[PDB]
Amino acid sequence: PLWFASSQSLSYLDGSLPGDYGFDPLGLSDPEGTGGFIEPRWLAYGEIIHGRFAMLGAAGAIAPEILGKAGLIPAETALPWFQTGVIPPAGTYTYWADNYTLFVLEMALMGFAEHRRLQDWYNPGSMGKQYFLGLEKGLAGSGNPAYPGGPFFNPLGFGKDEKSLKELKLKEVKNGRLAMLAILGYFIQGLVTGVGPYQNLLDHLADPVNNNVLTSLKF
Protein backbone atom coordinates (compact mmCIF):
# COMPACT_ATOMS: atom_id res chain seq x y z
CA PRO A 1 0.00 0.00 0.00
CA LEU A 2 2.35 2.73 -1.27
CA TRP A 3 1.21 6.01 -2.85
CA PHE A 4 3.86 8.07 -4.68
CA ALA A 5 6.56 6.71 -2.38
CA SER A 6 10.14 7.78 -3.09
CA SER A 7 13.46 6.13 -2.33
CA GLN A 8 14.33 8.84 0.19
CA SER A 9 10.93 8.69 1.90
CA LEU A 10 10.82 4.89 2.20
CA SER A 11 13.98 4.88 4.34
CA TYR A 12 12.54 6.51 7.47
CA LEU A 13 8.84 5.60 7.05
CA ASP A 14 8.90 2.25 8.84
CA GLY A 15 5.11 1.87 8.89
CA SER A 16 4.90 2.26 12.68
CA LEU A 17 2.33 5.05 12.37
CA PRO A 18 -1.41 5.11 11.61
CA GLY A 19 -2.17 5.75 7.96
CA ASP A 20 1.48 5.41 6.92
CA TYR A 21 1.33 5.19 3.12
CA GLY A 22 4.90 6.32 2.44
CA PHE A 23 3.73 9.47 0.63
CA ASP A 24 6.19 12.35 1.03
CA PRO A 25 7.46 13.80 -2.28
CA LEU A 26 8.97 16.90 -0.65
CA GLY A 27 10.66 15.02 2.20
CA LEU A 28 9.57 17.23 5.09
CA SER A 29 9.71 14.46 7.72
CA ASP A 30 13.31 13.50 6.95
CA PRO A 31 15.01 12.41 10.20
CA GLU A 32 18.34 14.24 9.83
CA GLY A 33 18.60 18.00 10.08
CA THR A 34 15.46 18.28 12.21
CA GLY A 35 14.91 21.39 14.31
CA GLY A 36 12.49 24.09 15.31
CA PHE A 37 8.97 23.11 14.28
CA ILE A 38 10.13 20.49 11.75
CA GLU A 39 10.19 17.11 13.52
CA PRO A 40 8.32 13.90 12.63
CA ARG A 41 6.66 13.61 16.04
CA TRP A 42 5.47 17.22 16.04
CA LEU A 43 4.22 16.85 12.47
CA ALA A 44 2.24 13.72 13.37
CA TYR A 45 0.75 15.46 16.41
CA GLY A 46 -0.23 18.43 14.26
CA GLU A 47 -1.82 16.17 11.66
CA ILE A 48 -3.93 14.42 14.31
CA ILE A 49 -5.04 17.71 15.87
CA HIS A 50 -5.87 19.17 12.46
CA GLY A 51 -7.93 16.10 11.60
CA ARG A 52 -9.92 16.34 14.83
CA PHE A 53 -10.63 20.07 14.49
CA ALA A 54 -11.49 19.69 10.80
CA MET A 55 -13.97 16.90 11.54
CA LEU A 56 -15.64 19.07 14.18
CA GLY A 57 -15.80 22.07 11.85
CA ALA A 58 -17.02 20.07 8.85
CA ALA A 59 -19.89 18.63 10.89
CA GLY A 60 -20.79 21.99 12.41
CA ALA A 61 -20.69 23.99 9.18
CA ILE A 62 -23.17 21.69 7.44
CA ALA A 63 -25.53 20.83 10.32
CA PRO A 64 -27.49 24.15 10.47
CA GLU A 65 -28.36 24.32 6.77
CA ILE A 66 -29.77 20.78 6.69
CA LEU A 67 -31.58 21.33 9.99
CA GLY A 68 -33.20 24.50 8.65
CA LYS A 69 -34.19 22.96 5.33
CA ALA A 70 -35.77 19.98 7.11
CA GLY A 71 -37.85 22.40 9.20
CA LEU A 72 -36.45 21.25 12.56
CA ILE A 73 -35.04 24.67 13.52
CA PRO A 74 -36.46 28.22 13.31
CA ALA A 75 -35.74 29.82 9.95
CA GLU A 76 -34.13 32.95 11.42
CA THR A 77 -31.50 30.74 13.10
CA ALA A 78 -30.41 28.54 10.18
CA LEU A 79 -27.75 30.45 8.24
CA PRO A 80 -24.86 29.64 5.90
CA TRP A 81 -21.50 29.25 7.58
CA PHE A 82 -20.30 32.74 6.58
CA GLN A 83 -23.45 34.72 7.44
CA THR A 84 -23.19 33.73 11.11
CA GLY A 85 -20.97 36.75 11.84
CA VAL A 86 -17.52 35.30 11.17
CA ILE A 87 -17.09 37.60 8.15
CA PRO A 88 -18.94 40.88 8.86
CA PRO A 89 -18.64 42.06 5.23
CA ALA A 90 -20.43 38.89 4.10
CA GLY A 91 -23.10 39.16 6.79
CA THR A 92 -23.83 39.56 10.47
CA TYR A 93 -26.19 38.10 13.07
CA THR A 94 -27.16 39.19 16.57
CA TYR A 95 -26.39 37.24 19.75
CA TRP A 96 -26.77 37.62 23.52
CA ALA A 97 -23.51 39.60 23.66
CA ASP A 98 -21.17 41.53 21.39
CA ASN A 99 -18.90 39.60 19.05
CA TYR A 100 -15.68 40.79 20.70
CA THR A 101 -16.88 39.84 24.19
CA LEU A 102 -17.51 36.31 22.92
CA PHE A 103 -14.07 36.44 21.29
CA VAL A 104 -12.43 37.31 24.62
CA LEU A 105 -14.37 34.60 26.46
CA GLU A 106 -13.44 31.94 23.90
CA MET A 107 -9.82 33.10 24.00
CA ALA A 108 -9.72 32.71 27.78
CA LEU A 109 -11.31 29.26 27.82
CA MET A 110 -9.23 27.95 24.92
CA GLY A 111 -6.09 29.37 26.51
CA PHE A 112 -6.88 27.49 29.71
CA ALA A 113 -7.27 24.26 27.73
CA GLU A 114 -4.37 24.67 25.30
CA HIS A 115 -1.73 25.86 27.77
CA ARG A 116 -2.35 22.73 29.84
CA ARG A 117 -2.11 20.66 26.66
CA LEU A 118 1.20 22.31 25.75
CA GLN A 119 2.62 21.82 29.24
CA ASP A 120 1.64 18.16 28.99
CA TRP A 121 3.49 17.93 25.68
CA TYR A 122 6.59 19.48 27.25
CA ASN A 123 6.64 17.45 30.48
CA PRO A 124 4.66 14.18 30.31
CA GLY A 125 3.50 13.63 33.89
CA SER A 126 3.91 17.12 35.33
CA MET A 127 0.38 18.30 34.62
CA GLY A 128 -1.28 15.83 37.01
CA LYS A 129 0.61 16.95 40.13
CA GLN A 130 -0.48 20.46 41.15
CA TYR A 131 -3.87 20.98 42.79
CA PHE A 132 -6.56 21.80 40.20
CA LEU A 133 -9.75 21.35 42.24
CA GLY A 134 -9.23 17.58 42.18
CA LEU A 135 -9.43 17.11 38.40
CA GLU A 136 -5.67 16.64 37.95
CA LYS A 137 -5.97 12.94 38.83
CA GLY A 138 -7.77 12.36 35.55
CA LEU A 139 -5.31 14.45 33.51
CA ALA A 140 -2.08 12.49 34.08
CA GLY A 141 -2.00 11.10 30.55
CA SER A 142 -0.89 7.77 29.11
CA GLY A 143 2.60 8.93 28.10
CA ASN A 144 1.76 9.23 24.40
CA PRO A 145 0.98 12.92 23.71
CA ALA A 146 -1.34 12.18 20.77
CA TYR A 147 -3.70 9.93 22.77
CA PRO A 148 -3.72 10.89 26.47
CA GLY A 149 -6.60 8.55 27.30
CA GLY A 150 -7.76 8.50 30.90
CA PRO A 151 -11.25 8.55 32.40
CA PHE A 152 -12.05 12.05 31.11
CA PHE A 153 -11.03 11.44 27.49
CA ASN A 154 -11.71 7.67 27.33
CA PRO A 155 -14.73 7.02 29.58
CA LEU A 156 -16.29 4.39 27.31
CA GLY A 157 -13.23 2.12 27.45
CA PHE A 158 -12.88 1.83 23.68
CA GLY A 159 -9.74 0.39 22.12
CA LYS A 160 -8.63 -2.06 24.81
CA ASP A 161 -7.29 -4.52 22.23
CA GLU A 162 -4.15 -3.38 20.41
CA LYS A 163 -5.41 -4.50 16.99
CA SER A 164 -8.75 -2.74 17.47
CA LEU A 165 -6.87 0.32 18.72
CA LYS A 166 -4.71 0.35 15.58
CA GLU A 167 -7.78 0.01 13.36
CA LEU A 168 -9.49 2.86 15.21
CA LYS A 169 -6.39 5.05 14.83
CA LEU A 170 -6.36 4.36 11.09
CA LYS A 171 -10.06 5.25 10.90
CA GLU A 172 -9.42 8.48 12.79
CA VAL A 173 -6.58 9.64 10.55
CA LYS A 174 -8.47 8.79 7.35
CA ASN A 175 -11.58 10.64 8.55
CA GLY A 176 -9.45 13.62 9.57
CA ARG A 177 -7.86 13.83 6.12
CA LEU A 178 -11.29 13.61 4.49
CA ALA A 179 -12.64 16.38 6.72
CA MET A 180 -9.66 18.62 5.97
CA LEU A 181 -10.31 18.19 2.25
CA ALA A 182 -14.00 18.94 2.85
CA ILE A 183 -13.17 22.15 4.73
CA LEU A 184 -10.87 23.28 1.92
CA GLY A 185 -13.72 22.63 -0.51
CA TYR A 186 -16.05 24.68 1.69
CA PHE A 187 -13.61 27.59 1.63
CA ILE A 188 -13.07 27.56 -2.13
CA GLN A 189 -16.78 27.13 -2.91
CA GLY A 190 -17.76 29.98 -0.60
CA LEU A 191 -15.10 32.08 -2.30
CA VAL A 192 -16.38 31.33 -5.81
CA THR A 193 -20.15 30.87 -5.85
CA GLY A 194 -21.01 32.78 -2.67
CA VAL A 195 -23.64 30.25 -1.55
CA GLY A 196 -23.71 27.63 1.19
CA PRO A 197 -22.43 24.18 0.22
CA TYR A 198 -25.74 22.40 0.89
CA GLN A 199 -27.47 24.57 -1.70
CA ASN A 200 -24.61 23.74 -4.08
CA LEU A 201 -25.28 20.03 -3.54
CA LEU A 202 -29.01 20.53 -4.10
CA ASP A 203 -28.40 22.46 -7.33
CA HIS A 204 -25.96 19.82 -8.56
CA LEU A 205 -28.44 17.03 -7.84
CA ALA A 206 -31.26 18.93 -9.55
CA ASP A 207 -29.36 19.22 -12.85
CA PRO A 208 -25.72 18.03 -12.91
CA VAL A 209 -24.98 19.18 -16.47
CA ASN A 210 -26.19 22.76 -15.99
CA ASN A 211 -24.72 23.07 -12.47
CA ASN A 212 -20.99 22.40 -12.06
CA VAL A 213 -17.67 24.23 -11.95
CA LEU A 214 -17.73 24.85 -15.71
CA THR A 215 -21.09 26.64 -15.97
CA SER A 216 -20.15 29.17 -13.29
CA LEU A 217 -16.88 29.72 -15.15
CA LYS A 218 -19.09 29.73 -18.29
CA PHE A 219 -17.20 29.36 -21.60
Partner: protein, 203 residues
Amino acid sequence: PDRPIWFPGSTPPEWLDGSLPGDFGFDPLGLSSDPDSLKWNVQAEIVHCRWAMLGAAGIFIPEFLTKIGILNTPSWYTAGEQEYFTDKTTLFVVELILIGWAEGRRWADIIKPGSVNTDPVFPNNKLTGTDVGYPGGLWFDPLGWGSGSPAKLKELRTKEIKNGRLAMLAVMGAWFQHIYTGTGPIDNLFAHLADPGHATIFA
Protein backbone atom coordinates in the same frame (compact mmCIF):
# COMPACT_ATOMS: atom_id res chain seq x y z
CA PRO B 1 10.17 23.04 47.24
CA ASP B 2 6.98 21.49 45.84
CA ARG B 3 4.81 24.55 46.45
CA PRO B 4 2.30 25.61 43.77
CA ILE B 5 3.68 28.00 41.17
CA TRP B 6 2.30 30.47 38.65
CA PHE B 7 2.84 28.15 35.65
CA PRO B 8 2.15 24.50 36.57
CA GLY B 9 4.57 22.02 35.04
CA SER B 10 7.36 24.61 34.70
CA THR B 11 10.59 25.00 36.65
CA PRO B 12 10.85 27.91 39.12
CA PRO B 13 14.02 30.04 39.11
CA GLU B 14 16.88 28.97 41.34
CA TRP B 15 16.96 32.20 43.38
CA LEU B 16 13.36 31.80 44.61
CA ASP B 17 13.75 28.94 47.08
CA GLY B 18 10.29 29.45 48.60
CA SER B 19 11.09 30.71 52.12
CA LEU B 20 9.90 34.24 51.34
CA PRO B 21 6.27 35.00 52.24
CA GLY B 22 3.82 34.98 49.35
CA ASP B 23 6.13 33.22 46.89
CA PHE B 24 5.00 31.55 43.68
CA GLY B 25 8.17 31.43 41.56
CA PHE B 26 7.05 34.26 39.26
CA ASP B 27 10.11 36.06 37.91
CA PRO B 28 10.63 35.35 34.19
CA LEU B 29 12.72 38.49 33.57
CA GLY B 30 15.28 37.68 36.28
CA LEU B 31 15.10 41.11 37.91
CA SER B 32 16.15 39.77 41.35
CA SER B 33 19.20 37.63 40.61
CA ASP B 34 21.43 39.52 43.07
CA PRO B 35 20.77 39.28 46.83
CA ASP B 36 20.66 43.02 47.51
CA SER B 37 18.28 43.34 44.57
CA LEU B 38 16.10 40.73 46.28
CA LYS B 39 16.09 42.64 49.58
CA TRP B 40 15.28 45.96 47.91
CA ASN B 41 12.53 44.40 45.81
CA VAL B 42 11.00 42.76 48.89
CA GLN B 43 10.94 46.05 50.79
CA ALA B 44 9.54 47.95 47.81
CA GLU B 45 6.80 45.37 47.27
CA ILE B 46 5.78 45.46 50.93
CA VAL B 47 5.60 49.26 51.01
CA HIS B 48 3.69 49.33 47.72
CA CYS B 49 1.25 46.74 49.07
CA ARG B 50 0.51 48.84 52.15
CA TRP B 51 0.16 52.14 50.27
CA ALA B 52 -2.01 50.70 47.50
CA MET B 53 -4.18 48.92 50.06
CA LEU B 54 -4.85 52.16 51.93
CA GLY B 55 -5.51 53.91 48.61
CA ALA B 56 -7.98 51.28 47.44
CA ALA B 57 -9.87 51.44 50.73
CA GLY B 58 -9.98 55.24 50.72
CA ILE B 59 -11.15 55.33 47.11
CA PHE B 60 -13.82 52.63 47.17
CA ILE B 61 -15.41 53.28 50.57
CA PRO B 62 -16.48 56.96 50.18
CA GLU B 63 -17.58 56.49 46.56
CA PHE B 64 -19.80 53.53 47.44
CA LEU B 65 -21.19 55.47 50.40
CA THR B 66 -21.93 58.43 48.11
CA LYS B 67 -23.81 56.04 45.83
CA ILE B 68 -26.15 55.76 48.82
CA GLY B 69 -27.55 58.92 50.38
CA ILE B 70 -25.49 58.59 53.57
CA LEU B 71 -22.65 60.92 52.51
CA ASN B 72 -21.86 63.65 49.99
CA THR B 73 -18.10 63.30 49.48
CA PRO B 74 -17.03 64.42 45.99
CA SER B 75 -15.41 62.18 43.41
CA TRP B 76 -11.85 61.01 44.02
CA TYR B 77 -10.59 62.40 40.71
CA THR B 78 -11.68 65.98 41.49
CA ALA B 79 -10.49 65.96 45.11
CA GLY B 80 -7.29 67.82 44.25
CA GLU B 81 -9.17 70.58 42.43
CA GLN B 82 -11.65 71.37 45.23
CA GLU B 83 -10.71 74.24 47.51
CA TYR B 84 -9.50 73.91 51.10
CA PHE B 85 -8.41 76.15 53.98
CA THR B 86 -4.89 76.63 52.57
CA ASP B 87 -3.13 76.58 49.22
CA LYS B 88 -2.06 73.15 48.04
CA THR B 89 1.68 73.90 48.12
CA THR B 90 1.76 74.55 51.88
CA LEU B 91 -0.01 71.25 52.57
CA PHE B 92 2.41 69.53 50.20
CA VAL B 93 5.42 70.99 52.03
CA VAL B 94 4.12 70.04 55.49
CA GLU B 95 3.33 66.52 54.26
CA LEU B 96 6.79 66.35 52.69
CA ILE B 97 8.50 67.14 55.99
CA LEU B 98 6.34 64.81 58.08
CA ILE B 99 6.68 61.86 55.70
CA GLY B 100 10.37 62.59 55.10
CA TRP B 101 11.25 62.10 58.75
CA ALA B 102 9.59 58.67 58.81
CA GLU B 103 11.06 57.69 55.44
CA GLY B 104 14.53 58.64 56.66
CA ARG B 105 14.04 56.49 59.75
CA ARG B 106 12.86 53.55 57.63
CA TRP B 107 15.77 53.95 55.19
CA ALA B 108 18.26 54.03 58.07
CA ASP B 109 16.68 50.82 59.36
CA ILE B 110 16.96 49.25 55.90
CA ILE B 111 20.66 50.06 55.56
CA LYS B 112 21.48 49.14 59.18
CA PRO B 113 18.95 46.63 60.54
CA GLY B 114 19.16 47.41 64.25
CA SER B 115 20.18 51.05 64.67
CA VAL B 116 16.92 53.03 64.90
CA ASN B 117 15.00 50.89 67.39
CA THR B 118 15.39 53.39 70.26
CA ASP B 119 13.42 56.56 70.95
CA PRO B 120 15.89 59.48 70.73
CA VAL B 121 13.95 61.88 72.97
CA PHE B 122 12.89 59.56 75.79
CA PRO B 123 15.16 56.47 75.72
CA ASN B 124 12.74 54.37 77.80
CA ASN B 125 10.71 53.45 74.71
CA LYS B 126 11.84 50.77 72.27
CA LEU B 127 10.70 48.81 69.22
CA THR B 128 10.70 45.05 69.77
CA GLY B 129 10.43 44.00 66.12
CA THR B 130 13.40 42.04 64.80
CA ASP B 131 12.76 42.01 61.04
CA VAL B 132 13.18 44.61 58.31
CA GLY B 133 9.77 45.79 57.16
CA TYR B 134 8.07 44.63 60.39
CA PRO B 135 8.82 47.32 63.00
CA GLY B 136 6.84 45.74 65.82
CA GLY B 137 6.63 47.66 69.07
CA LEU B 138 3.65 49.27 70.75
CA TRP B 139 3.29 52.03 68.15
CA PHE B 140 2.86 49.66 65.19
CA ASP B 141 1.89 46.39 66.93
CA PRO B 142 -0.33 47.38 69.87
CA LEU B 143 -2.39 44.17 69.94
CA GLY B 144 0.69 41.93 69.84
CA TRP B 145 -0.64 39.75 67.01
CA GLY B 146 2.65 40.20 65.14
CA SER B 147 4.63 37.91 67.42
CA GLY B 148 3.92 34.20 67.11
CA SER B 149 4.98 30.91 65.61
CA PRO B 150 6.91 31.04 62.31
CA ALA B 151 4.20 29.17 60.40
CA LYS B 152 1.41 31.49 61.56
CA LEU B 153 3.62 34.50 60.85
CA LYS B 154 4.30 33.23 57.32
CA GLU B 155 0.58 32.66 56.75
CA LEU B 156 -0.30 36.16 57.96
CA ARG B 157 2.41 37.73 55.79
CA THR B 158 1.10 35.80 52.78
CA LYS B 159 -2.43 37.09 53.41
CA GLU B 160 -1.13 40.66 53.69
CA ILE B 161 0.92 40.36 50.49
CA LYS B 162 -1.95 38.90 48.45
CA ASN B 163 -4.37 41.57 49.69
CA GLY B 164 -1.81 44.23 48.76
CA ARG B 165 -1.39 42.85 45.24
CA LEU B 166 -5.15 42.80 44.72
CA ALA B 167 -5.29 46.37 46.01
CA MET B 168 -2.66 47.57 43.51
CA LEU B 169 -4.56 45.96 40.65
CA ALA B 170 -7.85 47.48 41.83
CA VAL B 171 -6.37 50.98 42.16
CA MET B 172 -4.85 50.87 38.68
CA GLY B 173 -8.13 49.56 37.31
CA ALA B 174 -10.07 52.39 38.94
CA TRP B 175 -7.69 54.99 37.50
CA PHE B 176 -7.88 53.54 33.99
CA GLN B 177 -11.67 53.19 34.19
CA HIS B 178 -12.02 56.83 35.19
CA ILE B 179 -9.79 58.16 32.41
CA TYR B 180 -11.12 55.88 29.67
CA THR B 181 -14.84 56.06 30.47
CA GLY B 182 -15.29 59.18 32.61
CA THR B 183 -17.61 57.98 35.39
CA GLY B 184 -17.41 56.68 38.94
CA PRO B 185 -16.24 53.08 39.35
CA ILE B 186 -19.42 52.03 41.17
CA ASP B 187 -21.48 53.40 38.28
CA ASN B 188 -19.46 51.26 35.87
CA LEU B 189 -19.91 48.23 38.12
CA PHE B 190 -23.68 48.70 38.26
CA ALA B 191 -23.88 49.28 34.50
CA HIS B 192 -21.92 46.08 33.87
CA LEU B 193 -24.01 44.07 36.35
CA ALA B 194 -27.27 45.26 34.77
CA ASP B 195 -26.21 44.22 31.24
CA PRO B 196 -23.26 41.81 31.46
CA GLY B 197 -23.51 41.14 27.73
CA HIS B 198 -22.98 44.54 26.12
CA ALA B 199 -21.68 46.66 29.03
CA THR B 200 -17.99 45.89 28.61
CA ILE B 201 -14.85 47.81 27.67
CA PHE B 202 -15.77 47.32 24.00
CA ALA B 203 -19.20 48.93 24.57
